[PDB]
Design a protein around this ligand. Structure first.
Ligand SMILES: [K+]
Ligand SMILES: [K+]
Ligand SMILES: [Mg+2]
Ligand SMILES: [Mg+2]
Lengths: 117, 65, 153, 116
RNA sequence: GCGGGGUGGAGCAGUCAGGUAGCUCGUCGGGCUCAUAACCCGAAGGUCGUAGGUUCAAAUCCUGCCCCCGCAACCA
RNA sequence: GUACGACCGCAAGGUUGAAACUCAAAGGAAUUGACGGGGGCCCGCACAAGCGGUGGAGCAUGUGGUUUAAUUCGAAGCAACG
RNA sequence: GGAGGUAUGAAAA
């Protein structure tokens, strides 16, 4: 998808589109649930209620056509989950660097007598 | 050494937030201003002029100088 | 107390550095009236300071005190149903007290094996305007500045 | 773009203080407020917040070009004098000070008392 | 026969879309209180109804089974 | 200030107006205390400012609870529990 | 000095 503008504009346009798409899928689900609820009510009615049984089958046809045109909501991409925990415990002096000098052979010394704790 | 490199912006924030809660010592290098803020640096070591310093918005002063 | 300010007991100068401040430092570092151990630790730390730095340990300690001693503290005030901090200038007596208190506490928390070594390292860092003690002073000033809107109280 | 004389309306309520520096014809030039400066909750009414608001608004006005201002104080807020002193310190010359707190001649019915 | 359900003591998520067992109330213990309530701090409490498959991995998918709830079990 | 009756009202309700039954009090003013999320003025390691502790762990000891043939009796907020 | 307007706590002693 190609938008005109900057990163924020893309986020604004995108967030709205997924919101408007989400509301569409919600309303399609409500209508399916409504038909489903009536189909079940007819299914469990007495066999002697001919008209209700008839109407139940008629709505079963609409329910089938609905379920075949019902947009699937895209699975939201899952975000990373990190739980970093240390096995052992830190000391008051984890690392001691004292008077450390280093140079790559043939190049100026990067640091001289570097000491930190 | 530059952990947030190559990571998408969403994953960077997740990385920084979880490190902030890490119960251990962290020696980090990062040119990303957002990542260092999330981790909440304590002491900064400036190079090449060795300067073990308390972390602060004075980081900008070293960058300027 | 309710009656009013009370007399402040005095301190004699240090035997070798001839300073009341060093005596106060010995008092702060002392535990269970073991003043002999306290004084030995202080003198060992001062020797370490003179060794690792050519400057006089007394001058270095005074520099650390200047760096650590706060200026504006925050005192909590309960105003109706809301309790918040209020900035307050620190009288010089409490300034030295807070400076010594912070130095000794953070020195004891340091990672060096021996107390005099911890104290010497902390003192030198404070003189150089860095370390836990200086950080505490910065945080105190930061809190006072943040609540500076209530200075009228 | 370039002005020399203006008016400074200080709207100081018990909850917030607003400084509005306009030209002598009322057209807004610069403005600031305790909330605009980041003060929140009770702090917005503190005289210090009024001081900072007047300071920031004055700096913008002077940057635009402005030397003299006449002050109009409105509302019962406690930061009016702090704002005035902040104006003087930031540089704008306080030509005159007047209070324009509206005073209804009875007029409309005020809302109910609190805690009843 | 048609559906709805079985996750901590109770009520509920999580199930679709496989990785990690949660929220609320409740219970136990300790605090605060003259004491109770409210409040504060700790802790426990389920291998997700059950048995098999699928998977590297099943509360989650598949199959059966057992329970509980509602409806139906016959119309001129 | 209810019921019945009557009058008034569009209505809401108003005016008039009981009895059965029930209690040994209800009540006005003022007094002395105590009390107040009343006020004023004071004091005490009361708080605040600090030092060191308890609550966490092992053990000593007292208490509750439980248990027991008995686990003797007494102490129970401060002011019972080395 | 005086006037009007501006959470719980059982029964009997
Ligand atoms: K303890
Ligand atoms: K004990
Ligand atoms: Mg205290
Ligand atoms: Mg204990």
């Amino acid at each position: 998808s190609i938008y005109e503008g900057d990163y924020y504009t893309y986020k604004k346009k995108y967030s709205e589109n997924q919101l408007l798409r989400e509301k569409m899928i919600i309303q399609q689900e409500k209508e399916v649930k409504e038909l489903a609820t009536f189909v079940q009510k007819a299914k469990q009615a007495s066999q002697t209620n001919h008209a209700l049984k008839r109407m139940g089958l008629e709505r079963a046809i609409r329910l089938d056509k609905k379920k075949k045109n019902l947009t699937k909501r895209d699975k939201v991409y899952k975000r990373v989950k990190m739980d970093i925990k240390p096995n052992r415990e830190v000391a008051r002096t984890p690392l001691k660097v004292e008077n450390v000098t280093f140079h790559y052979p043939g190049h100026p010394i990067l640091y001289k007598d570097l000491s930190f704790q | 050494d530059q952990p947030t490199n190559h990571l998408d912006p969403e994953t960077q924030s997740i990385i920084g937030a979880n490190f902030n809660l890490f119960e251990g010592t962290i020696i980090v290098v990062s040119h990303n201003p957002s990542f260092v803020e999330q981790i909440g640096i304590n002491r900064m070591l400036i190079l090449p002029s060795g300067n073990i310093d308390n972390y602060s918005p004075e980081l900008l002063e070293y960058y300027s100088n | 107390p309710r009656k009013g300010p009370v007399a402040k007991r005095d301190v004699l100068p240090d035997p070798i550095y001839n300073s009341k401040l060093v005596t106060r430092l010995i008092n702060r570092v002392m535990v269970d009236g073991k003043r002999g151990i306290a004084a030995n630790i202080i003198y060992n730390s001062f020797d370490i300071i003179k060794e690792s730095t050519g400057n006089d340990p007394l001058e270095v300690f005074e520099q650390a005190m200047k760096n650590v001693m706060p200026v504006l503290e925050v005192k909590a005030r309960r105003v109706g149903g809301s309790n918040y901090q209020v900035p307050v200038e620190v009288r010089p007596e409490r300034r030295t007290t807070l400076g010594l208190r912070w130095v000794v506490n953070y020195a004891r928390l340091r990672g060096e094996h021996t107390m005099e070594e911890r104290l010497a390292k902390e003192i030198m860092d404070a003189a150089n305007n860095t370390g836990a003690s200086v950080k505490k002073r910065e945080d105190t000033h930061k809190m006072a500045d943040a609540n500076r809107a209530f200075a009228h109280y | 773009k370039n002005i020399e004389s203006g008016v400074a309306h200080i709207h100081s309520t018990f909850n917030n203080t607003i400084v509005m520096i306009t030209d002598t014809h009322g057209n807004a030039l610069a403005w600031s407020s305790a909330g605009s400066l980041g003060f929140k909750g009770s702090k917005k009414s503190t005289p210090f917040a009024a001081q900072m608001a007047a300071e920031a608004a004055t700096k913008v006005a002077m940057e635009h070009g402005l030397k003299t201002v006449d002050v109009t104080v409105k509302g019962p807020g406690s930061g009016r004098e702090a704002a005035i002193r902040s104006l003087q310190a930031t540089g704008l010359e306080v030509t005159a000070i007047r209070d324009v707190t509206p005073v209804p001649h009875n007029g409309c019915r005020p809302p109910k008392r609190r805690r009843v």
